């Protein structure tokens, strides 16, 4: 039966294809090998257990060597592969990171688009993924990107929902929460941060970077602005401060100034996250290090560059022998990279067509993790040939909103506006016109659903968009009614005809429909996450042999022997051998 359920998924996929793969490129027909005895060395995880989050923050500050966060298991594939990287490929390498690179600060491996996408697109539980990484790497900190008032979603939630979620995340194994607000609005962060401290985990409050601190003609976003935000987040009870350069806009000179000034403004350690879209982010990371930054993010070489993080192996190599040398073995970095390379090939279906660095990022400000996405939508809305006008629209739409931080979800809101401008052939001057008579997302933002910029929203655009609906300027969750968690849990148990887990109730609070659809498919198809990635996406070619582990003990030998023509009722029969026993699995012909 465990086996039966899987065999049926392997029949369906073999006969019909995966919807996400069926007409995108296929992988080069001509497998990843986990690298090849000791126990594991205590690391940052044992240290955090010893010191607690406050003192641990202090230990980072005092530490001479730069500390490294590896973003491969989250941001890396979120930016390069539409976030389609699977638990199977992520879980299998954790033990290797654990044994081979025990000096790492943390693995960024959760939150961001992974929660959503893992269920909705990859038919797998994100809590299962977290647990398996926890078991693989008991000596490293596990880091998530947490979207402040948004959790792992796009709408701002009731306070208790946010509270509940952070509680279960901590229980699932998150040690380090990188929390951010899409308008750098500290008031909208106080709920999540307090929730993190109350779990006794690391609250790394982030400041999103935009504009250019060294351009006097763009004064909205200068030095003071960042340094004051820092001082505000310390008072707010942060253990660490992050600079989140979501679009890779921080230039090297700017880093040199920024990180001096930040460390003078606060005693807290500083953590720097950036993207390589410009093709010089590594210069900025090195600059940051030279100015004394406490911790930096990079991605394994094979999933680095462009819209991802800059190259981990190269940055480490740049520092090796220096006062701030991180002490990571370059030969082990390569071995793990060669693995991710072999992993990456399996996702040929999800490669963008981005060929290299673009200094154009300084014009549009699209976040690394939005870039490809917004090119896909433009191709979808038929605008492929006009893509550069869309970049111009983004920036123009950005000025219109009064020059704002564009990170999730405010970035979609700008995206949505820019596409409408190019489509409906509209200028900003038309957009503002009091007479030239808006995406749901835009109206949402302009009322006050995602908070307030420093500016305040431009009054003329606002009164035009809202047309009737008076705006609110209070903090969103201070209007949302406190979800009846008791009463909202029943609804998902009479819809699934069973008790769920606290973790499951969490997935549901965040994504009612996506979790629902996931639970049904899961009762149909079984533990599909244990299937290797080429089997998950393409089934089993004829005569072929597959090993899957359904639990701790049992390994299954699954062989596709044969696949019949289609019968009278529209069915197709796949003939299997499961551990030497003959199996026939009928699967409906969806052609």
Cα–Cα distance for residue pair 443/441, rounded to 1 Å:
6
Is 524 marked active-site?
no
Q: Is 60 annotated as a binding residue?
A: yes
Catalytic residue among 274, 408, 412, 533: 408
Q: Is 244 annotated as a binding residue?
A: yes
Restricting to residues 208-227, name those near its own copies by CB under 8 A.
214-215
- Residues 330, 333, 339: CA angle, nearest 5 degrees: 145
- If residue 448 lies in a helix (H) or strand (E), which one and from where to where? none
75 binds, among Mg ion, Zn ion, its own copies, none (CB under 5 to 8 A by kind): Zn ion
Sequence-distant contacts of 519-526: CB under 8 A, at least 24 apart: 521/123, 522/123, 522/125, 524/5, 524/8, 524/9, 525/5, 525/6, 525/8, 525/9, 525/12, 525/123, 526/2, 526/4, 526/5, 526/6, 526/8, 526/9
Q: Does 315 bind its own copies (CB under 8 A)?
A: yes
Q: Does 204 bind Zn ion (CB under 5 A)?
A: no
Q: Which residue is nearest to Zn ion (CB)?
A: 75
Tokens coding 503? 């973790």
Catalytic residue among 12, 70, 75, 276: 75
Cα–Cα distance for residue pair 493/32, rounded to 1 Å:
40
Q: Does 245 bind Zn ion (CB under 5 A)?
A: no
Nearest CA-CA partner of 143 in 90, 71, 195: 71
Q: Residue 21 or 303: which CB sits closer to its own copies?
A: 303
Is 227 marked active-site?
no
Cα–Cα distance for residue pair 418/374, rounded to 1 Å:
10
Could you tell me if residue 200 is left (phi over 0), alpha (psi between -120 and 50 degrees) or otherwise beta?
left
Q: Is 567 annotated as a binding residue?
A: no
Residues 269-308 as x/- pattern, contact with Mg ion by CB under 5 A: -------------------------x--------------
8-state DSSP, 105: S
Nearest CA-CA partner of 155 in 519, 517, 518, 512: 512
CA torsion sign for 111, 327, 255, 310 is: negative
Q: Residue 21 or 302: which CB sits closer to Zn ion?
A: 302
Q: Does 75 bind Zn ion (CB under 5 A)?
A: yes
Catalytic residue among 45, 163, 201, 244: 244
Cα–Cα distance for residue pair 279/263, rounded to 1 Å:
27
Q: Count the site residues for Zn ion by CB under 5 A.
A: 1
Q: Is 171 annotated as a binding residue?
A: no
Which segment (65-73, 254-262, 437-445, 504-512) binds Cl ion by CB under 5 A?
504-512
Distance of closest approach, residue 41 Cβ to its own copies, in angstroms: 23
Distance of closest approach, residue 340 Cβ to its own copies, in angstroms: 10
Nearest CA-CA partner of 79 in 333, 299, 283: 299
Cα–Cα distance for residue pair 438/430, rounded to 1 Å:
13
Residue 139 · residue 172 · CB < 8 Å: no
- As to burial, measured by CB atoms within 10 angstroms (0-12 exposed, 13-18 middle, 19+ buried), residue 252 is middle
Q: Is 462 annotated as a binding residue?
A: no
Q: Does 63 bind Mg ion (CB under 5 A)?
A: yes
Q: Residue 249 or 319: which CB sits closer to Zn ion?
A: 249
Q: Count the site residues for Mg ion by CB under 5 A.
A: 2
Which segment (58-66, 131-139, 304-312, 520-528) binds its own copies by CB under 8 A?
304-312
Is 396 marked active-site?
no
Residues that bind its own copies (CB under 8 A): 30, 214-215, 251-253, 276, 278-280, 282-283, 286-287, 301-306, 308, 310-318, 321-322, 330, 333-334, 337-338, 341, 344, 351, 355-360, 362-363, 384-385, 388, 542-543, 561-565, 567-568, 573, 575, 582, 584
Residues making up the annotated binding site are 1-3, 60-61, 63, 74-75, 78, 147, 244, 273, 275, 294, 408
Residues that bind Mg ion (CB under 5 A): 63, 294
Task: Show which residues are catalytic.
Answer: 75, 244, 408
């Amino acid at each position: 039966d465990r086996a039966t359920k899987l065999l049926t998924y392997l029949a369906d996929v073999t006969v019909n294809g995966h919807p996400e793969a069926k007409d995108r490129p296929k992988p080069l027909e001509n497998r990843p090998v986990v690298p090849y005895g000791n126990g594991v060395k205590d690391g940052t995880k044992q240290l955090l257990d010893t010191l607690g989050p406050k003192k641990f923050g202090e230990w980072m500050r005092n530490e001479k060597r730069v500390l490294l966060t590896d973003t491969t298991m989250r941001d890396g594939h979120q930016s390069l592969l539409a976030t389609r990287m699977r638990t199977y490929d992520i879980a299998r390498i954790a033990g290797t990171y654990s044994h081979a690179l025990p000096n790492l600060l943390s693995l960024e491996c959760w939150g961001g688009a992974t929660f959503d996408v893992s269920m909705r697109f990859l038919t797998e539980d994100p809590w299962e993924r977290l647990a398996l990484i926890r078991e693989g790497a008991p000596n490293l900190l596990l880091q998530m990107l947490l979207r402040g008032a948004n959790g792992v979603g796009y709408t701002n939630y009731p306070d208790n929902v946010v509270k509940y979620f952070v509680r279960q995340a901590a229980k699932g194994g998150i040690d380090l929460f990188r929390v951010f607000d899409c308008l750098n609005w500290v008031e909208n962060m106080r709920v999540s941060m307090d929730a993190i401290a109350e779990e006794n985990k690391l609250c790394e409050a982030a400041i999103c970077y935009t504009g250019d601190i060294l351009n006097s003609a763009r004064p909205k976003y200068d030095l003071k602005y960042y340094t004051n935000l820092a001082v505000e987040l310390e008072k707010a009870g942060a253990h660490i401060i992050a600079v989140k350069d979501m679009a890779g806009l921080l230039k090297p000179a700017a880093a040199k100034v920024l990180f001096k000034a930040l460390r003078e403004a606060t005693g807290l350690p500083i953590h720097f996250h950036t993207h390589d879209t410009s093709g010089i982010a590594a210069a900025t990371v090195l600059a940051a290090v030279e100015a004394g930054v406490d911790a930096v993010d990079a991605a394994m070489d094979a999933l680095s560059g462009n819209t991802s993080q800059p190259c981990l192996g190269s940055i480490v190599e740049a520092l090796s022998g220096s006062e701030r040398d991180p002490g990571l073995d370059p030969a082990w970095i390569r071995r793990i990279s060669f693995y991710w390379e072999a992993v990456r090939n399996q996702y040929a279906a999800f490669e963008s067509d981005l060929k290299g660095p673009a200094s154009e990022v300084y014009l549009h400000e699209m976040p690394g993790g939005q870039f490809t996405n917004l090119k896909e939508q433009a191709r979808s809305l038929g605008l492929e040939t006009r893509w550069h006008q869309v970049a111009q629209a983004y920036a123009d739409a950005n000025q219109m909103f009064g020059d704002i931080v564009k990170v999730t979800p405010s970035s979609k809101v700008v995206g949505d506006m820019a596409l409408m401008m190019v489509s409906q052939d509209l200028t900003v001057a038309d957009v503002v016109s009091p007479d030239r008579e808006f995406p749901e997302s835009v109206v949402s933002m302009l009322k006050g659903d995602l908070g307030q910029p420093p500016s305040g929203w431009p009054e003329a655009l606002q009164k035009k968009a809202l047309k009737g609906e008076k705006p609110y300027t209070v903090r969103p969750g201070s209007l949302l009614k406190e979800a009846d968690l008791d009463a909202e849990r029943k609804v998902i148990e009479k819809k699934l005809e069973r008790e769920v887990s606290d973790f499951e109730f969490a997935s549901y609070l965040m994504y009612p429909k996506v979790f629902t659809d996931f639970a049904l498919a899961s009762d149909t198809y079984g533990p599909v996450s244990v299937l290797p990635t080429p089997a998950y996406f393409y089934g089993l070619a004829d005569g072929e042999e597959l090993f899957a582990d359904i639990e701790k003990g049992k390994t299954l030998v699954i062989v596709n022997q044969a696949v019949s023509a289609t019968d009278s009722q529209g069915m197709v029969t796949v003939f299997f051998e499961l551990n030497g026993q003959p199996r026939r699995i009928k699967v409906p012909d969806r052609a």
